[PDB]
Design a protein around this nucleic acid. Structure first.
Ligand code: MG
Ligand code: ZN
Ligand code: ZN
Lengths: 55, 143, 130, 308, 373, 154, 69, 164, 200
RNA sequence: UUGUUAAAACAAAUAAAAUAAAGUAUGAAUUAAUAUCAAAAUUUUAAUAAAAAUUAAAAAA
RNA sequence: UCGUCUACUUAUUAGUUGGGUUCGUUGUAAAGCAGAUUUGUUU
């Protein structure tokens, strides 16, 4: 008799940090969501967004 | 217009090819011929473009696109339970004796047991699965 | 009669019961059911006779499939059971409908040799074809 | 064996079905008069047949020919009024089923009028199989319809007829024949490339007037139930038609009556005089009119223009 | 009608808002530093209603640009900022294939109808339950809810100006009813009350309406749940309704719960419907085909079995003008009374249905415990 | 013909369909995509609760939420606790501020959905909009609506 | 299906009936709907509702072998 | 034959060593039955029996190969294509939910390819292989493309860059 | 000619409509139940938003007897007469309508059973409750059972005085839901029976 | 009470009366974390909460 | 948001005879649109 009680049949991924923690940096791009920026060394630091209207 | 004679296996090459044709608001077009091998990535990119999402984390490996992380599935499952909880309160009246059963199947968050090895024990603690199995077999061989 | 036959159970098999059930299923709503029963009993059981073959051919005439018109003749030949005049006439009619020229001519020749009467419409059709 | 709770559940639902279907009383509304089976499933159409004129025209324009199926007892009332109103450019082949019961004179009159107009009337009896009918239809196609341009294409016939007349039975017979030969449409003969296209709702009449229902129940098309339509309304109309014919001695000779009846009550009492109550006596009279021991009967009238 | 609006997804609406040029970019000088968005807009545009400004701001047609390259969407309670722009659409912005909200445009009432004192008395008699938010009236039999093809024929939609006892504008009917239906009709006084009550009449799971009907014949079960899928198609003179048991991509489901209250010798029966959907002739067609027993007087659906020889004892089958036994008996409201129970209003049966129930011996005025309140 | 697989967890970013649902510009009328509950709660509904430190002879029922800021710190106007009991078991009702009026239930908190925040809220405090009991508000959204001065508009 | 159609509850089916029809139309595994219907065709008498203590005493007596089912 | 059909070249079977066989009519029927068993437009070719030592009807094989090249470059008009598919959309039975084909116009020859313009704008609404097989089934017997492979190009409707 | 046989069927049906509307003036006043009357006064105030009218609530049930002509009509009509079915069905319908108006009364009335043929005085509402099959009569029965449970659950000793064997046996004799001789629930209105016998 | 047949018979099924199936000795097994176990109502804390707090007072076989 | 529409028209005469064939109130520009919305370890 198969196991009747089950919570999740499939299997979760193995990437703990972010999506596609196995690919090389030349194949997959890095995420830019605020949840992933504050963890990266470059994105968590200062970022300027103010613009200038004319030359 | 750019004609990708073969679908690139990664989003990095696709956007780099796509960038050349359209420059500074100029009208452009991309024709990417694909076969059965690039069927996975062409299915995600086509969906990523229709909903206007950034091509971040796109791969050709099918198991990579269908299997999510535990915490990411944790966030999505918590929202799916709430959306059913809102529709249950808004458009339904449940009796008193069914109040425990409705909230147990459509309104409560039930954590999994070791989601790392969830493919073996199904997410339910096997010490429970052993007690449940003793209830099935005792009434199966009795039948 | 169909209901009573469906209720029937645990009764020995005989050619009389076989042809009676064939008549029942022929006059029933589905003429193909008697053909199915004949194909079921074809493996084993009592041997069918010329009356049963006439019933099968009448059912085929009523329904209109006629896909096994030559199969019935092949079964009769391999069973090595002679057929009656009405059986051979219905087989002639089936072959003429299925435009099997060689088999129809052979059966007509052997019928004229046996000196067994045929249907007037079939005889007129044969004389008009010749 | 599956789950015992499921066994108990199916037992309970089967018992409920049994206790629901035990009642022999039949509901008033004739479910058959509105249900119409097709390839997608059982469908219920609502409304008359006049508001679907353009929906019928757009399909008769696409179909090659118009194969209609009517009943010989009452030709005109069974079909489509817009087909008779507006002339159809496509050739029409009208199969009158149950032709053994219709008036031979009226049959020859209606077939003469159809030949004058351009249509082809084919009268089919119960002893005749559908194979001769479809063969004659193929012969009509190869005689009247011009040759198709491309060899692979096929000529399409739009079938117009109620499911009680025999359209659905013909469709099922052709379907099973084709399936057995090979093992939304229906192919009949692949050598001349003839196919048929059915339209359920355009042929389903739906609602009907009182006299229309009387004629349909007398012909056997529409069902008869005690709640919606007593046997009196139809049997008195049958007797009134017989009296307009005036064949009282003929009624007596048919019903084995001692003398010629005078009124409907007299007819009922004389049929009652085997012994049986007036209800079953009227039922047997209607059954006689259905089976057709009374022959040469035409309930549908013929307009002056069709008689000219 | 110089601009024909078209369906637009969120992506297309954003693309059109980016492509358009009929915008006005208000700067925020030192004088308007720190003012709320709603106050700013209500001080700048005196002709725009406050509800219109609310709808614009909360839908996003009036956003602000903080010089950061991207546009920023704010609510009414948000404060402004120095050096940033506030983008407001102009009149010509709504002339493209983009549908504007309701309040931004001007809707002209045009010609109005003048009612007589007799019609006003009849409307005041039809009024059943009066409230500062909702007005319940008893619609008579054979009255058109909305103006039909004949413009000279009377209708309820033009009797609205006679019901506003103190409001500044006429009430708005919440849900329309069939011409033959003799039930209760609900009107909303407040323009906001109509929007708030419009949610109740969408497809639901729990019923809140009662339909009393008298069908010809007795169905098999005393209580049951009717369900069928409708397809409405345009025809030459009218519409064609196709009923299926199975779903379809174009089909719209219709569900009701019917209970047989009494049976008159299996030739006539009194039943109560509680619907869950809103479809044209829904309960009528349900009783006609599903229950296989048409309601007394539904000539349009099974006219032969509508007037039966069984009930011919009471009514003349040759007239065929008896009122269709279709009455919206009881309907609930979200408003509560002083007792705490929801207000469920009940409409009295027409005199013809009362005569029918008296001839049949059934009580005409009975409460319905299935729908509480 | 080509069968490509993509998980739904990637397309959840475009779950909202309008600006009000995505940028939270107004009240979500039972249409909210993403929620935020405190970590550890299994029953997904925000909780507005009160304390009980005495008998009703000394501590009134409307003094349970005395710790929460707003209208509860004042005396209610209507007292339905005496005489016959209401069907919905409402014990107090505060002054009708604009289009919103507050009500305190009895017994365990009836979980409802606030149309402003979109969350299921289990509390005794409920704010009814214009006497229409289909659109309710949690006390937190009620206090914020009043402080912003949106009680007449929302 | 023919029994259902004869009952004429096509438009009046409910949740339990629809679920039963679904689970019987679905091709089962170890089970067999033919044998299940043959076993259902038995006209045997049903059991009446009893109390918990009375039913436990019944079970104990049956285990001992002194009382019938 | 499947590999040659995938390239786009008209092929033709040849039964070499035809004089060494024992029965001439037995082998000719085994090949014909093997031919009709083929699928995907391979079946629509012919089989020529040839002997290289005796020299049996070698000129007939060289004549059929010349006819295949003429049909390989055959030019079909456009209006004839629309009338064929308009009447074919009705006569065939399509159980699959597919979008209506707007126009049919052959674009390139040798091999002759056809353009099938769809009405919808979605990319996943391509016709199944069963519908492509039926489309290739009629083009060969109606327009005498026997033994000639045919490609198909399903063009989805493209939107306008200005959108009006 | 014309539709002689059709008009004859319509003429006879029109006669049945008139002779049954004539029998309406012969009525037997029956006072309604005390609890049921207050149920009509209550439902009327919520429906019409007005005080009930003594002429509309009709506290006296107006039951109509079968017309004297109809009973002697089907009597002298032979079973072979085709016009007997159309008048028999007209009487069966009025025989049930008389039951529908009878159940609304609660005064003592003669009711005979058909099993052992015993004549006894009963109240029509409680006796014909199981035959009439009316949901509002079903819902009031479920409503009164709760009303009794509310009084008994508030005071358990209240059951001792109200529900006793002396009280239970007395109430059964006051509302004889079954014949005291055969214990059968099947009954018949004696007034309709004696009306059918002395005319037939 | 229902259904079948005929101008009373048969089959189903329960609710009233009647019959039995100890108060004697013989005597197991399921179960078992536990205070001489928390009668109830209110409120609340991470999912039935029999977990906590506030009122209140819940006898024994 | 449960609306309405098996007759008009062209001739003909005094009921007869041949041709042709929808409108509209209100909300909303999303808070709107397929389908389901059921659970008693109950015997
Ligand atoms: Mg929906
Ligand atoms: Zn809130
Ligand atoms: Zn008695």
């Amino acid at each position: 008799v198969p196991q009747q009680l089950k919570a999740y049949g499939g299997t979760f991924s193995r990437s703990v940090g972010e999506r596609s923690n196995h690919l090389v940096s030349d194949v997959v791009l890095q995420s830019l969501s605020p949840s992933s920026t504050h963890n990266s060394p470059l994105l968590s630091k200062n970022i300027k967004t103010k613009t200038v209207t004319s030359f | 217009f750019v004609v990708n004679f073969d679908m690139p296996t990664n989003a990095l090459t696709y956007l780099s090819r796509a960038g050349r044709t359209a420059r500074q608001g100029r009208l452009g077009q991309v024709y990417s011929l694909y076969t059965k091998r690039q069927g996975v990535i062409v299915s995600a990119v086509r969906a990523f473009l229709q909903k206007q999402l950034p091509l971040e984390g796109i791969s050709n490996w099918k198991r990579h696109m269908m299997e999510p992380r535990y915490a990411e599935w944790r966030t999505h499952k918590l929202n799916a339970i709430a959306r059913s909880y809102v529709s249950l309160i808004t458009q339904k009246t449940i009796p008193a004796h069914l109040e425990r059963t409705y909230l147990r199947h459509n309104a409560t968050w039930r954590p999994l047991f070791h989601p790392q090895t969830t493919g073996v024990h199904g997410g339910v603690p096997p010490r429970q699965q052993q007690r449940v199995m003793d209830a099935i077999t005792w009434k199966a061989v009795c039948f | 009669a169909v209901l009573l036959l469906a209720r029937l159970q645990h009764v020995p098999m005989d050619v009389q019961l076989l042809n009676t059930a064939l008549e029942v299923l022929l006059l029933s709503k589905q003429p193909q059911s008697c053909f199915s029963a004949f194909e079921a009993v074809r493996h084993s059981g009592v041997e069918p006779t010329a009356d049963t073959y006439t019933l099968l051919l009448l059912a085929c005439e009523r329904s209109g499939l006629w896909g096994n018109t030559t199969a019935i003749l092949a079964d009769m030949q391999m069973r090595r059971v002679k057929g009656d005049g009405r059986t051979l006439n219905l087989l002639l009619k089936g072959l003429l409908t299925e435009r099997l020229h060689g088999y129809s001519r052979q059966l007509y020749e052997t019928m004229v040799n046996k000196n067994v009467e045929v249907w007037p419409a079939l005889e007129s059709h044969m004389k008009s074809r010749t | 064996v599956h789950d015992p709770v499921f066994m108990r559940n199916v037992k309970r639902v089967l018992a409920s079905y049994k206790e629901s279907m035990d009642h022999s009383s039949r509901k008033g509304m004739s479910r058959e008069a509105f249900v119409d089976i097709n390839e997608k499933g059982a469908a219920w159409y609502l409304g008359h047949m006049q508001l679907a004129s353009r929906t019928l025209a757009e399909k008769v324009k696409d179909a090659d020919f118009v194969l209609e199926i009517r009943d010989a007892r009452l030709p005109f009332t069974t079909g489509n009024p817009n087909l008779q109103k507006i002339i159809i450019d496509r050739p029409r082949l009208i199969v009158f089923n149950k032709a053994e019961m219709s008036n031979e004179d009226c049959n020859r009159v209606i077939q003469q009028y159809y030949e004058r107009t351009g249509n082809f009337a084919l009268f089919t009896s119960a002893k005749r199989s559908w194979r001769d009918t479809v063969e004659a239809v193929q012969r009509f196609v190869t005689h009247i319809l011009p040759a198709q341009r491309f060899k692979t294409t096929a000529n399409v016939g739009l079938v117009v007829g109620m499911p009680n007349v025999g359209k659905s039975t013909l469709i099922n017979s052709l379907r099973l024949a084709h399936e057995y030969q090979f093992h939304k449409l229906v192919p009949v003969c692949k050598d001349p490339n003839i196919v048929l296209y059915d339209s359920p709702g355009l042929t389903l009449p739906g609602c009907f007037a009182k006299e229309a229902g009387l004629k349909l129940a007398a012909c056997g098309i529409i069902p008869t139930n005690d709640i919606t339509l007593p046997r009196s309304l139809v049997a008195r109309y049958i007797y009134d038609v017989l009296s307009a014919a005036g064949v009282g001695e003929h009624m007596a000779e048919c019903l084995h009556l001692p003398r010629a009846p005078i009124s409907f009550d007299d007819c009922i009492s004389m049929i009652c005089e085997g012994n049986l109550d007036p209800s079953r006596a009227q039922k047997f009279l209607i059954h006689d009119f259905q089976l057709g021991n009374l022959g040469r009967i035409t309930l549908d009238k013929l307009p002056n223009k069709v008689r000219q | 009608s110089h601009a024909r609006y078209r369906p637009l997804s969120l992506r297309a609406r954003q693309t059109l808002s980016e492509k358009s040029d009929d915008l006005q970019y208000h700067v925020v000088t030192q004088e308007w530093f720190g003012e709320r968005v709603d106050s700013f807009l209500t001080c700048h545009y005196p002709q725009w209603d406050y509800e219109t400004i609310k709808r614009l701001v909360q839908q996003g047609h009036i956003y602000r640009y903080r010089k950061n390259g991207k546009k920023k969407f704010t609510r009414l309670t948000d404060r402004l900022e120095f050096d940033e722009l506030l983008v407001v659409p102009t009149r010509a912005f709504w002339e493209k294939q983009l549908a504007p909200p309701s309040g931004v445009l001007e809707e002209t009432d045009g010609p109005k109808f003048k009612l007589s004192a007799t019609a006003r008395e009849m409307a005041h008699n039809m009024v059943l339950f009066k409230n500062e938010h909702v007005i319940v009236i008893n619609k008579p039999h054979g009255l058109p809810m909305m103006p039909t093809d004949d413009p000279q024929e009377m209708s309820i939609a033009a009797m609205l100006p006679a019901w506003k006892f103190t409001n500044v504008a006429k009430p708005v009917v919440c849900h329309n009813l069939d011409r033959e239906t003799s039930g209760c009709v609900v009107l909303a006084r407040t323009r906001n009350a109509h929007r708030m009550l419009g949610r109740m009449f969408v497809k639901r799971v729990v019923p809140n309406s009662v339909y009393w009907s008298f069908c010809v014949g007795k169905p098999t079960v005393n209580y049951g749940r009717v369900r069928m899928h409708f397809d409405i198609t345009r025809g030459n003179k009218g519409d064609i309704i196709v009923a299926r048991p199975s779903p379809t991509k174009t089909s719209k489901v219709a569900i009701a719960e019917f209970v047989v209250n009494a049976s008159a010798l299996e030739f006539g029966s009194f039943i109560s419907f509680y619907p869950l959907t809103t479809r044209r002739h829904q309960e009528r067609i349900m009783a006609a085909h599903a229950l296989r027993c048409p309601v007394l007087g539904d000539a349009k659906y099974g006219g032969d079995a509508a007037f039966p020889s069984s009930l011919s004892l009471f009514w003349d089958p040759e007239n065929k003008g008896l009122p269709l036994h279709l009455h919206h008996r009881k309907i609930q409201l979200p408003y509560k009374n002083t007792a705490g129970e929801f207000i469920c209003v009940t409409a009295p049966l027409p005199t013809q249905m009362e005569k029918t129930f008296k001839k049949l011996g059934w009580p005409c005025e009975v409460d319905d415990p299935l729908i509480p309140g | 013909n080509i069968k490509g697989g993509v998980g739904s967890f990637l397309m959840r970013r475009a779950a909202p369909k309008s600006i009000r649902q995505k940028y939270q510009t107004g009240p979500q009328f039972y249409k909210r995509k993403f929620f935020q509950f405190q970590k550890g709660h299994h029953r997904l509904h925000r909780r507005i609760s009160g304390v009980q430190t005495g008998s009703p002879t000394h501590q009134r029922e409307y003094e349970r939420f005395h710790h929460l800021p707003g209208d509860v710190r004042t005396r209610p106007q209507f007292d339905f606790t005496f005489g016959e009991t209401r069907a919905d078991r409402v014990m107090f009702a505060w002054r009708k501020r604009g289009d919103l009026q507050l009500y305190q239930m009895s017994g365990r908190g009836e979980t409802f959905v606030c149309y402003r925040c979109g969350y299921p809220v289990r509390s005794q405090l409920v704010a009814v909009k214009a006497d229409n009991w289909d659109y309710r508000m949690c006390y937190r959204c009620y206090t914020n609506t009043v402080h912003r001065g949106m009680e007449n508009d929302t | 299906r023919r029994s259902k159609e004869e009952a004429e509850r096509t438009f009046l089916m409910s949740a339990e009936e629809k679920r039963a029809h679904k689970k019987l139309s679905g091709r089962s595994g170890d089970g067999s709907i033919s044998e299940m219907l043959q076993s259902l065709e038995v006209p045997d008498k049903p059991f009446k509702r009893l109390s918990r203590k009375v039913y436990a005493n019944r079970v104990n007596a049956i285990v001992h072998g002194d009382q019938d089912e | 034959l499947h590999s040659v059909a995938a390239e786009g070249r008209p092929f033709l079977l040849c039964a070499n060593k035809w004089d060494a066989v024992l029965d001439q009519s037995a082998t000719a029927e085994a090949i014909d039955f093997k031919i009709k068993r083929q699928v995907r437009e391979v079946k629509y070719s012919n089989a020529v029996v040839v002997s290289a030592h005796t020299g049996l009807n070698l000129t007939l094989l060289m004549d059929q190969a010349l006819e295949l090249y003429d049909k390989w470059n055959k030019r079909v008009r456009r209006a004839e294509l629309t009338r064929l598919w308009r009447k074919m959309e009705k006569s065939v039975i399509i159980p699959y939910h597919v979008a209506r084909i707007g126009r049919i116009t052959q674009v390139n020859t040798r091999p002759p390819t056809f353009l099938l313009q769809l009405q919808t704008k979605n990319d996943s609404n391509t016709l199944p292989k069963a519908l492509q097989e039926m489309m290739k089934n009629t083009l060969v017997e109606e327009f005498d493309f026997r033994g000639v492979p045919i490609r198909l190009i399903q063009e989805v409707k493209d939107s306008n860059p200005d959108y009006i | 000619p014309q539709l002689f046989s059709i008009e004859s069927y319509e003429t006879q049906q029109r006669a049945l409509r008139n002779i049954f509307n004539e029998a309406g003036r012969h009525c037997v006043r029956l006072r309604k139940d005390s609890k049921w009357l207050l149920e009509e006064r209550r439902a009327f105030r919520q429906s019409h938003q007005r005080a009930p009218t003594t002429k509309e609530v009709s506290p006296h049930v107006d039951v109509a007897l079968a017309p004297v002509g109809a009973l002697k009509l089907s009597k002298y009509l032979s079973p072979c007469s085709a016009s007997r079915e159309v008048v028999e069905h007209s009487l069966l319908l009025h025989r049930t309508v008389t039951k529908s108006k009878l159940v609304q009364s609660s005064e003592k009335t003669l009711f005979r059973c058909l099993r052992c043929f015993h004549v006894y005085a009963a109240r029509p509402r409680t006796l014909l409750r199981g035959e009439v099959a009316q949901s509002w009569l079903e819902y009031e029965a479920e409503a009164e059972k709760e009303e009794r449970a509310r009084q008994l659950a508030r005071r358990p000793h209240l059951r001792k005085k109200k529900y006793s064997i002396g009280r239970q046996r007395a109430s059964l004799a006051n509302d004889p839901r079954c014949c005291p001789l055969c214990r059968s629930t099947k009954a018949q209105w004696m007034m309709e029976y004696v009306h059918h016998h002395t005319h037939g």
